[PDB]
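Exercise: predict the structure of this protein bound to 2-acetamido-2-deoxy-beta-D-glucopyranose.
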Amino acid sequence: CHQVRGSDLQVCLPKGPTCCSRKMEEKYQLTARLNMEQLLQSASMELKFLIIQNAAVFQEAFEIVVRHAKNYTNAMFKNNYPSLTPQAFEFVGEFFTDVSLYILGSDINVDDMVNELFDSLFPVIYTQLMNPGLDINECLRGARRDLKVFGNFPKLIMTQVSKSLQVTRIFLQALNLGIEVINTTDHLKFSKDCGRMLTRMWYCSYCQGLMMVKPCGGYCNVVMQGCMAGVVEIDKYWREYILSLEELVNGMDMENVLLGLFSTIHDSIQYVQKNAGKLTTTIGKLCTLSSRRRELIQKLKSFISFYSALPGYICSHSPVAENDTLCWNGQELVERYSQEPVVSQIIDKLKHINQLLRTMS
Ligand SMILES: *[C@@H]1O[C@H](CO)[C@@H](O)[C@H](O)[C@H]1NC(C)=O
Ligand SMILES: *[C@@H]1O[C@H](CO)[C@@H](O)[C@H](O)[C@H]1NC(C)=O
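Solution:
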């Protein structure tokens, strides 16, 4: 043994003498772990950055659309229903606040936003528009629904906005989930047998005192196919996630729906006032964007074989003798080579988001 870069070892199969002890064997084991990790990192980096890019852009683009709709809706109220301000400035803000929250994954029930909106809207219509001239607020909030003053305008808005806010939410959910599974890949822990085999493949030749010999490609594939056995099962679910995503995008907006809200609300106010006469009395008694989507799907399809091409990536981006001549077989230099929990969580997450994508478009 010159420079290197009995027997009681536990990894390197000792044909006879050996250059390395049990302690240098443990060194070689940890550097195999570090090496596999770096390689997995490099495999997943470009795809990870792609989805990180678009998740950040699309989130702001959608946030811009909500802010613009809020101000337009606020301005339309200020201009057409000044008697309803400043109260309108408050329930419009309440609604679009929940819009963004619902878009970004918060537990928000759409039927509320609409119902809270109309529950807040009706008392100020009654007091300021229908019968001009504080303790009686809660009665009017209850009579709004008990007397169905807006007809089916709330249901109409409910379906108008729930369909458009659901697709936008799920699109952001799927982008962030892809980041989360791909980022999990470079942290995948493998079996101890795989680690011992990786050590034999990459480093045990130095223990026999060889300097330039590389492992056989065939030996690398048998080793890698054995290491990535659970990982390759993820391929079919990843391909369905890509295709389901491509389905959603080809089917697509939220701007028109949210911009159109004031028009629908205004007609709902007109409906109510068509009944002010009798309604007062009873209440008296009672009381390039699309271009970005395309380019993302284009780049995303180029990575559709990520999990199936992964073992080949590790073998090709490490020194191997793909020729299978004068190569290291794990225990001797040969002339020609002859012969889950975390994974299941990735599966489950891909299954869940793939249902959500399917049943949308
Ligand atoms: C548009 O709406 C958003 C809502 O948060 C607000 O921050 C922004 O200042 C508005 N722009 C105006 C009022 O010019
Ligand atoms: C990636 O995974 C690591 C470890 O699991 C975690 O610390 C990090 O926050 C994750 N990053 C993203 C963007 O998911």
